[PDB]
Structures are given as structure tokens and as C-alpha cells.
Design an enzyme around this catalytic site. Structure first.
Site, PDB file in Angstrom:
ATOM      1  N   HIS B  34       0.805  -1.218   0.000  1.00  0.00           N
ATOM      2  CA  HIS B  34       0.000   0.000   0.000  1.00  0.00           C
ATOM      3  C   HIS B  34       0.846   1.279   0.000  1.00  0.00           C
ATOM      4  O   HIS B  34       0.305   2.378  -0.064  1.00  0.00           O
ATOM      5  CB  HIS B  34      -0.951   0.020   1.205  1.00  0.00           C
ATOM      6  N   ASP B  56      -0.348  -7.849   1.906  1.00  0.00           N
ATOM      7  CA  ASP B  56      -0.022  -6.448   1.676  1.00  0.00           C
ATOM      8  C   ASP B  56       1.483  -6.276   1.470  1.00  0.00           C
ATOM      9  O   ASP B  56       2.060  -5.259   1.856  1.00  0.00           O
ATOM     10  CB  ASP B  56      -0.503  -5.595   2.851  1.00  0.00           C
ATOM     11  N   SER B 108       5.241   2.123   8.203  1.00  0.00           N
ATOM     12  CA  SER B 108       4.946   0.840   7.570  1.00  0.00           C
ATOM     13  C   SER B 108       6.196   0.396   6.829  1.00  0.00           C
ATOM     14  O   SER B 108       6.845   1.198   6.170  1.00  0.00           O
ATOM     15  CB  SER B 108       3.789   0.963   6.579  1.00  0.00           C
TER      16      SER B 108
END
Lengths: 152, 157, 156
Positions: B34, B56, B108
Site C-alpha cells: 500500500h 499487503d 509501515s
């Protein structure tokens, strides 16, 4: 010797780089160009966890570089500014000795072998506590930084 | 002989801003799927990635010259503490939590390590739960099966 | 570390692998003539609809799996493709493999293009000398299932 080369910044010696075991070392926090064309041309690998940058030196140099060792028995050692003392896994130099521009200089035992590279230091009474990088038995890099240590 | 070790996590730049991080584990390159941007490292930024939408994650093999210098990983997650860039990470009852106010968009991609230096998880996001922040992550079980955990009301970082 | 999810599954029958099932774009496919239990609890508990004309049983794959299933395509330019036993040639509208390749237990296996997309699912075949022509279900433009079965083809 000439296995230690000054790193030039603006127009002064902002630090030092050195060649050990066929590897070029340079303190990460020290910005500037090495005073040697070949070395300053080498692409380095950044090891921020040890505040070090390093790179393999060309074969036509490997054997002609500093030798290293993990052997750090308590006792006396040497470095450019004079005697160094090792006790309780901590290297120290006399008070007032060591300052800005000294990052990179190595510490040697009797046999002229590099046992550590200096990153910084700090005054502790009549002694200067040193921040250095070393090597253990397995050949892994280990870093020890004194409390409130200043980067040189 | 020497056994040097350099950075294994790299910032993912997007429009001149840090939007996440990529890291190399078990001879592979990973980056949050993402997260948009380019790895701040020429060699890795050029590798072709395969997508794993179920986790992801986007990944690719690391060249032969980099294989020996990548995070080792493990499924071993005994309860207690671990560490990441921002400090201590607690693991209890299958959930990694950090102190509230720690962790945000941009984190992230960062890895969580055990004291031996092995990666036990990669962060994808988080959400505050009281005085703690529950993390979204990718982990590995005993079989080597990649598992993903995402807290209720989690937010991608 | 396993990042890719299995997309083919053996169909067991009396301890022997009697064929395969695979998941393509959110659907499980199974050769209708192959009897046995899919070697996966979740998949085996799924009710399937039958499409006799195509010799295919199919069901909607659980949503938690849709994410990593085979992607299909209609694009079948002549040349080579691959399946578990090696190279698969495609020419004059039919897939063929070498003699000695293709047999009982191979129905259900997919044929993929180099991008990992499924162009066909094998249902059987028949040796024709130095080559073995395959029986398959493919996809046309409209993403419609289409079948091709060689003369005297056998259901592997």
C-alpha cells in the site's frame, strides 16, 4: 604507515578513514572527502547501527592494510595521541586528550594490530571515555558508547 | 575473518517525502504494497517485484552478492519485548503493541527484531487502544507460512 | 518462507492421486469425471455445480482465498506453455505434449503462459504417435468457457 587517511571538509581535517583487513572504514557522522583518490572513489555500505561506512579495497591493497584482532585483554594500548587504557570493556585516554577531528583513528595493541576505531568521547573526571567500534570472536562488529558521549 | 553488517532497511521516497520503508529478509526484498514511492537504493529500487496482496507485501529475490547480508527471520515469538526503530515493542497474546503516541504513517515497512537480531514481523499499520497502539503486521508461523494480523479499526501507515 | 499460495490441489481416491482441482479467479474447478476428495478440508466441503458439457464441476472459492488464485486469460498465441510435466506446445488450435507424458491423474492440472496466467485446464488426452493431444477447457474473449476434445480422447 599510511593506512589512515584524513577526511577533508570545507578546508580542514574533519576526521579520518582507515584501511583494515582489506576494508575501508569511515565514521558515518563524519562528512567530507577522503584525501586519497582511490578510497574516495569507492562506494560504501552504510552501517548506521555502528556509525560506520565501509567498502572492500582493491586487491592491490588488501594485504597492505591494517591487521585486526578481537583480542582485547585488559591493559595498555596505543593510538596517535598517546597511550590508551582498556579496563572493563572500556577504552580511555588521559583527560583533555581526544577531540573533534579524531573520529576514525584506530587503537592498536603492542603488535600494531587494530582492536578498535574511535567514534567519539567524553570527559569523566581525569579520564576521557571513548566511544568505539570493535570486533568479537565471531568477527562481528560491536559498538560501545559512553554516557553523554560527544561525537568527534 | 570479518563479518560486517550494514543497513537492511531503506526509506521509500515519494514526491520527495518518506512514505514508508523497505527491508531485506531471508534473501528477499519487501515493501508494503500500500506504500507508493521508490526505494532509496539504486540496486534494490530496480528489482522486479512479485505481489502478495493477501499479505499487503511486494517482494523480489536479492542478488547473490547481497544474500549473506540480509535480516534473518524466525517464527519464534515468545511473549515479552522486542524492538524496532522507535523503541520497545511488546508481544502478548498474539499482538504486538507499542506505547501510544509512537508509530504513525511512514512507519509501515519497518521490521521488529528479537534480541538475537532476527526479524519476527514487519509493520504495516496501527491504531491506538487506550495507552497502547496495536500493530498490523506480517509474521511467520512454524511451517514458514506467512501470516498477517490486522487490529480492528487499524490504519495503514 | 512461503509467499505464494497453492492453487492446485490433489484429488485423493483410495490413497492415490486421481486428479487435480485448481482455483482460478475466485472459482474452484474440478474435472467432473474425476472421483475422489480434494485434499483440503475447506475446499472439499464446498458444494459444486456441474457443467457436464465441459466435464467441469465448479464452486465459488471462499473469499479468504480469492486474493491468491490463478488469473486466467484468453490470449493463446501459438508457441509453448507450461504445465507440471514440462513444455506444452500450442499450434493449429490444439495443445500437445510428448509421448510418455500425460496420464491418469493429470486431469485438472493447469497450463500457464510465461506470465503465470492460466490458458487452459487439462481434462484428458490421447497419444497420436510421437505426440499426445490434450483435451481442455479454455477461455475466449468474453471470458466464456470453451472446450476442445481430440478424436478418441480419453478421460485421464
Amino acid at each position: 604507515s599510511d593506512k589512515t587517511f584524513p577526511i577533508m571538509l570545507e578546508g580542514k581535517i574533519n576526521g579520518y578513514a582507515c584501511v583494515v583487513g582489506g576494508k575501508l572504514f569511515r565514521p558515518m557522522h563524519v562528512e567530507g572527502k577522503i584525501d586519497n583518490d582511490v578510497l574516495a572513489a569507492l562506494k560504501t555500505k552504510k552501517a548506521s547501527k555502528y556509525d560506520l561506512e565501509y567498502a572492500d579495497v582493491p586487491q592491490n591493497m588488501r594485504a597492505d592494510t591494517f591487521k585486526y584482532t578481537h583480542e582485547k585483554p585488559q591493559g595498555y594500548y596505543s593510538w596517535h595521541h598517546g597511550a590508551v587504557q582498556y579496563e572493563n570493556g572500556r577504552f580511555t585516554v588521559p583527560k583533555g586528550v581526544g577531540a573533534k577531528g579524531d573520529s576514525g583513528r584506530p587503537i592498536l595493541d603492542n603488535q600494531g594490530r587494530v582492536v578498535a576505531i574511535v567514534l567519539g568521547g567524553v570527559n569523566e573526571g581525569s579520564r576521557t571515555a571513548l566511544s568505539v567500534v570493535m570486533w568479537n570472536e565471531k568477527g562481528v562488529t560491536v559498538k560501545y558508547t559512553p554516557e553523554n558521549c560527544e561525537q568527534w
